[PDB]
Amino acid sequence: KRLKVVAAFQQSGNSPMGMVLDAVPVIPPELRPMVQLDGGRFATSDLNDLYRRVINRNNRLKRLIDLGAPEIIVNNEKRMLQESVDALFDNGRRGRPVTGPGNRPLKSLSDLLKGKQGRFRQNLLGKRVDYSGRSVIVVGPQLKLHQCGLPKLMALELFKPFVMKRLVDLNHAQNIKSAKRMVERQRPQVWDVLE
Amino acid sequence: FFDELRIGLATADDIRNWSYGEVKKPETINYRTLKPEKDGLFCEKIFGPTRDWECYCGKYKRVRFKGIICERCGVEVTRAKVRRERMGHIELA
Amino acid sequence: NSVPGAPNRVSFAKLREPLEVPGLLDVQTDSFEWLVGSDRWRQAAIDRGEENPVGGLEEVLAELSPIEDFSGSMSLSFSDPRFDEVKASVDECKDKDMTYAAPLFVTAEFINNNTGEIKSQTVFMGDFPMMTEKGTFIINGTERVVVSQLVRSPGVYFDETIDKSTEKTLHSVKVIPGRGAWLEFDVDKRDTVGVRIDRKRRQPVTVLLKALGWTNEQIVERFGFSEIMMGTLEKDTTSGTDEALLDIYRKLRPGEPPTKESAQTLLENLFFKEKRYDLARVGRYKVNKKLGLNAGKPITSSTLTEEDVVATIEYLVRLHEGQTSMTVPGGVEVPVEVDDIDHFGNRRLRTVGELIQNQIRVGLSRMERVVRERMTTQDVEAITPQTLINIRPVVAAIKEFFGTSQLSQFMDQNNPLSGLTHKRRLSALGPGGLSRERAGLEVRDVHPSHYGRMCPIETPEGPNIGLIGSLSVYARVNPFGFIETPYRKVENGVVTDQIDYLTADEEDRHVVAQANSPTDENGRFTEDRVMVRKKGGEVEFVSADQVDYMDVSPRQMVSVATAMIPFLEHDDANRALMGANMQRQAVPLVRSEAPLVGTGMELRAAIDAGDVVVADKTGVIEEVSADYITVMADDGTRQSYRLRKFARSNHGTCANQRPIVDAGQRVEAGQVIADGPCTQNGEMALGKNLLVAIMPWEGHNYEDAIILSNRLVEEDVLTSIHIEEHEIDARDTKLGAEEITRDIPNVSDEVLADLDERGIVRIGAEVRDGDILVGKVTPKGETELTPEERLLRAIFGEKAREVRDTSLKVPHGESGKVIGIRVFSREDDDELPAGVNELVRVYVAQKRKISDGDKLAGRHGNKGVIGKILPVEDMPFLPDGTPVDIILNTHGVPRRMNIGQILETHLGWVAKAGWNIDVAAGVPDWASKLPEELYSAPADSTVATPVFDGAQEGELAGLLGSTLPNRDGEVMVDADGKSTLFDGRSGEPFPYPVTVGYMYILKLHHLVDDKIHARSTGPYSMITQQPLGGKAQFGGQRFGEMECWAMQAYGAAYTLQELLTIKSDDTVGRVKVYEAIVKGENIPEPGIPESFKVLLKELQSLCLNVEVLS
Amino acid sequence: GDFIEDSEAVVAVDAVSFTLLQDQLQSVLETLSEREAGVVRLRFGLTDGQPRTLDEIGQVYGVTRERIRQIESKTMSKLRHPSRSQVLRDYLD
Amino acid sequence: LRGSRLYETDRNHDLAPRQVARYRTDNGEEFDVPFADDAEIPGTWLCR
Ligand SMILES: [Zn+2]
């Protein structure tokens, strides 16, 4: 078992020094957005909260070392920084998870791509798509094996761009804006082109 | 057109090279004027401008200056969508 | 008979009901009255056989007080809660969007021990939400219900398991308190008795006994019966109480160094001090009953005691040995047996009162902590309760529970039955309950103890199967939280009028006979042997002298909804469950009518739901309008009732009350004077009764599809009114306040034609998709207009207007008339949220007719969507010219085992067309047991067939064979229930007769109108940039992993690629493809979806050097 | 986060209409004006996104100040003719 | 329910002229900054 791990560093061009960090990276803000919700409220991903804590502690240590605090306080600050970084990478792994309002644990980096939710199984292997609809089904006994009955409104919504093109090129609308306006109000000329 | 995807163990040098600036303040946005604070999270000098070709102080506000770093605030004038691809780092003691 | 009105409805019931159905809302109201404490509750408790009853608030306050600070020098206490009056009324709170609460006052006393002062006075504890007459809470103008929670009661539980290695039987016991460390004993495969204290490592129980103060002689004296006890004692290395104490302290608290006083006081505070270990009031009673301790004395101290620990050890040891009975010294004899935790003798019910009490306790604990913090920070002379009492935590906890707790739920207001069933819901989830992902088969299966307490039919069909149920009709809740059911005392084989309410564990010691057993007028059993249930819930024949209890009614086991399925006994459990669930989804219709055939419950339920208006006092009606009813009581008092008209319900269904009484009509207290949404003449009318033919028709009813006649559309038989509310708000912004205006930039003059002068839409207008409802505008600020826009404005001389349009527009696919508008302006009071200056609500109502795709269903779980609506001339018609209304396929019934619907159809046809049983040659044999009232009835006469006591097979056959003729003196339906139909299209008669009758079809709230949305392009996600989901937005359909597997199986590489890149998150590809489609060009090549880039730059974080090579 | 729509994502149809407006404007009305188009292009900056004051034309070319304004007024008047002012009258919104 | 966060003809042939500076840090790390021809280069800069 030990050789399984040791051989990886031996038979490669990488050193195990990477397990100790001297500079933690920061994700771009857009992936942790601070969006101004309607009415002036702000919604923030809790990830950027974790980061803040790290920085705070990392600042305090820099102060304590500067003025020569007793070794006990410096060691306590170093331990706190270690725990903060650990929770940033993986919250709740070692100790009790960090919680904000209420009692719900914060979502760490690992949680963003860990399980059923996240990115791998929720945003990479399968995703929501445009030009799609859904509706209840009923039996059509007069249909052929290769035919299906599509509601008028659903078909219009699905084919809106094609309908707009066929409206503008047939001189029903003078431009794309006029064709879109005509389709939204569903004037009679739309249904002739839809079929 | 990708040939292969290689994973490795990032070192301090790689992390520093990835970054466009060190984050050394926990501030995200000021309470009034709701704009990003300097040197903190969401900093424009590090992660890029919030608007397209508009620096913090507004000296440069048009596409013609694309690529120029404002000498008064340090914000590069580029697409606002660079804020989802610019990384920062924290140098911890 | 109970209701003065009592619309005529002959009943097939052959058994007289010895007990009247109790109040169906008692579970909520009685619990809430106990919580706050009311005079009627005090009187009931006194009469029940209790002295000095204590309410929930009083109990919590007594638990909190008295308090003394650390290093005690002065004390505080609370007492005497009081409620004065509700600030506002029900409908004022509903309209104004405020909670319906009343202020609470408690007298607080502060005492200085040094001098003996008393700063006693009243303190305002906050606004306590109050329960309405219907048993609901109005929070922020929304009606909510608190559902009772099923939870394992505190106590001591023993069990046994067969080992895998040795295959020995190993017995374990666990003590489960309300709060406190967990204590559990065990027996190992090495034949040793150990204990785990506070989830610590196992050790022999002898060390625990020694530490408790037992020398090595009393253990031998008491536990001399068993041999494993002696094995453990001999193997125990520790000697003396002091030796054991040190080891226990080291193990439990290895961190701090051991000491003498701390070691001595360790176990004392761990279990035997109420401030840190407390069995609930129920827990102490259960422990006493299990171990036979403190037999026959009031329970005041609930904390654990040293006697019960050794009692539990003795019980476990004896149970492992194999002894049946056991008696501890100073205690009564009790049996020795394991405990199944699914038995309702173990599972108890937290009512709304207890749920609120827990949150009050938490809030008071936080308040007490704050009081302790503030007590030793200011002077001890000029200190008063007000200064150091902060009421914020308790009100905050109360508000959090109602608005956040999973148990506090948004009321289901589809129809009165839905709301009634919601209030009688028993849930196993919620805090302290089960988890949907951690619930096996055993918990969700039906247990024999459920009989008469939890209905086995009514329960969710989906993943919540068996975790959520409904209270039975006659079930009652014991103050400890256990569910009791009534039974008739029978002695010497004679049924007696005495009725006793028994609990599951209490009835397990008796033999109960079913209600439907023959009995003479005297009461003595006619038969020699009777059917009964035994201890294990096993069914058996026994002699009539062995029975000591009897069921109150045949329908003791069913709930309210299940009680309204006629011919329930002829329907399979699955279909009965489906029908009961469906009954709660029926939407109200424009006009309602009661079923031809039903149970006797429809009446009572309708009154209990509280949607109908009942006269308070006997009198004579004075004035009857569509808006109010004025009644002059028998005395000089007169009362006016306000009728709700076109009021939107919680689910956008019209709630409309209309009078049924006439001017100058005498009415009695408890008599219905106005009908509710889904009621007709005081009964519950959820659907419509209509003519049905059972046959396949050209494949349009294939696979559960349904065909309807166009008449139901022309006559609005299945039409319903649906109302929706739209809200807009004008508030402040850093660029200036946004104003509600009638002028909007870049809008045609015709568009704003129906807008009021203020900018709000006019009442009575007909708004369609995209129409303006309220006009609003917001400041822009910076413009930086593009050069092309600047030139376009210059050539047209249009101002660069300061404001942008933000008007409220009708959502996609909506329509209907505007019926109501509400305006709140901060200027005229209107205490709106901070920053909001104007609030406008617009109500749009639309009338929906039955159409293709709408879902209908019966009362037997025969659901289906409408596939075809035919003109009247196409439907098959009776030989007299009458066309049928619905065609149901014949291939469903036999395989689904819901044959009860065929009997429903037969009896409905019998009811619609009157019947008369000839009695010239005596009475027919089949009609021997029919009551006289059923010998003959006129046309359109309603009937009642109670479940498990109703119309019988032969009676139904005879009634089919003895119907009256039609207007032409002929019978359309023969004695077998079938009739000869004519083909509407071809015109020739069908070769064989077809079953025809009347069925009660109800319209479920599943309409294609509100689930059709499609999408071509819409809003996207912030981070992943993928389309949003949901009909609320322009939701895109999810192309899940299984769909990708299917596409790979087909080998459709290109379709999959375009689905996953172009149509989801290829930001550049999306716009380029739209441009190509509009311009009529080839689709461009996809590339690099944004989600992969996000994943790459997320893995770059947490120090992984992910990179792409070439 | 699954319910907050992005308010900066490019709207497809709009992004099309604009490029049509830029296509139906730069082509027809610009070309029928011969060299009088140039002054309009610099005036509004639709050629490089650089609006220019009157003098910025006279700083190099020999045209004078008031003549440029007269040309601008004449072009403004004659380009509003319905025959050529109706095709561009649908992109105002 | 919607939120918000805090299109010009792209051209590569023509761009505003720029001049490149050069800075050394205490550790000997070299950095370059493109400034406009307006100059006004500060004596000290903040590096990455
Ligand atoms: Zn600048």
PDB file of N, CA, C and O and ligand atoms in Angstrom, chain B residues 55-60 70 72-74, ligand 1:
ATOM      1  N   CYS B  55     -12.738  51.812 -17.258  1.00  0.00           N
ATOM      2  CA  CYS B  55     -11.901  51.638 -16.081  1.00  0.00           C
ATOM      3  C   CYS B  55     -12.625  52.170 -14.845  1.00  0.00           C
ATOM      4  O   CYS B  55     -13.740  52.693 -14.918  1.00  0.00           O
ATOM      5  N   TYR B  56     -11.981  52.029 -13.685  1.00  0.00           N
ATOM      6  CA  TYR B  56     -12.617  52.416 -12.429  1.00  0.00           C
ATOM      7  C   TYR B  56     -12.913  53.911 -12.397  1.00  0.00           C
ATOM      8  O   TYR B  56     -14.026  54.331 -12.064  1.00  0.00           O
ATOM      9  N   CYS B  57     -11.920  54.735 -12.739  1.00  0.00           N
ATOM     10  CA  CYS B  57     -12.079  56.182 -12.661  1.00  0.00           C
ATOM     11  C   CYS B  57     -12.739  56.781 -13.896  1.00  0.00           C
ATOM     12  O   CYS B  57     -13.088  57.966 -13.876  1.00  0.00           O
ATOM     13  N   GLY B  58     -12.924  56.004 -14.960  1.00  0.00           N
ATOM     14  CA  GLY B  58     -13.606  56.484 -16.142  1.00  0.00           C
ATOM     15  C   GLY B  58     -12.757  57.277 -17.110  1.00  0.00           C
ATOM     16  O   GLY B  58     -13.303  57.828 -18.073  1.00  0.00           O
ATOM     17  N   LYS B  59     -11.442  57.355 -16.894  1.00  0.00           N
ATOM     18  CA  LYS B  59     -10.586  58.084 -17.823  1.00  0.00           C
ATOM     19  C   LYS B  59     -10.666  57.486 -19.222  1.00  0.00           C
ATOM     20  O   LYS B  59     -10.749  58.213 -20.219  1.00  0.00           O
ATOM     21  N   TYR B  60     -10.638  56.161 -19.313  1.00  0.00           N
ATOM     22  CA  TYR B  60     -10.767  55.445 -20.576  1.00  0.00           C
ATOM     23  C   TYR B  60     -12.134  54.777 -20.606  1.00  0.00           C
ATOM     24  O   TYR B  60     -12.450  53.966 -19.729  1.00  0.00           O
ATOM     25  N   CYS B  70      -4.996  51.654 -17.372  1.00  0.00           N
ATOM     26  CA  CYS B  70      -5.166  53.021 -16.902  1.00  0.00           C
ATOM     27  C   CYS B  70      -4.120  53.329 -15.839  1.00  0.00           C
ATOM     28  O   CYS B  70      -3.975  52.583 -14.865  1.00  0.00           O
ATOM     29  N   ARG B  72      -4.136  55.679 -13.704  1.00  0.00           N
ATOM     30  CA  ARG B  72      -4.704  56.275 -12.502  1.00  0.00           C
ATOM     31  C   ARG B  72      -5.383  55.263 -11.591  1.00  0.00           C
ATOM     32  O   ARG B  72      -5.407  55.467 -10.372  1.00  0.00           O
ATOM     33  N   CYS B  73      -5.936  54.182 -12.145  1.00  0.00           N
ATOM     34  CA  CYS B  73      -6.571  53.144 -11.346  1.00  0.00           C
ATOM     35  C   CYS B  73      -6.062  51.742 -11.643  1.00  0.00           C
ATOM     36  O   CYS B  73      -6.342  50.829 -10.859  1.00  0.00           O
ATOM     37  N   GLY B  74      -5.330  51.537 -12.737  1.00  0.00           N
ATOM     38  CA  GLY B  74      -4.743  50.250 -13.035  1.00  0.00           C
ATOM     39  C   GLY B  74      -5.673  49.249 -13.682  1.00  0.00           C
ATOM     40  O   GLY B  74      -5.243  48.121 -13.958  1.00  0.00           O
TER      41      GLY B  74
HETATM   42 ZN    ZN F   1      -8.946  54.613 -14.830  1.00  0.00          ZN
END
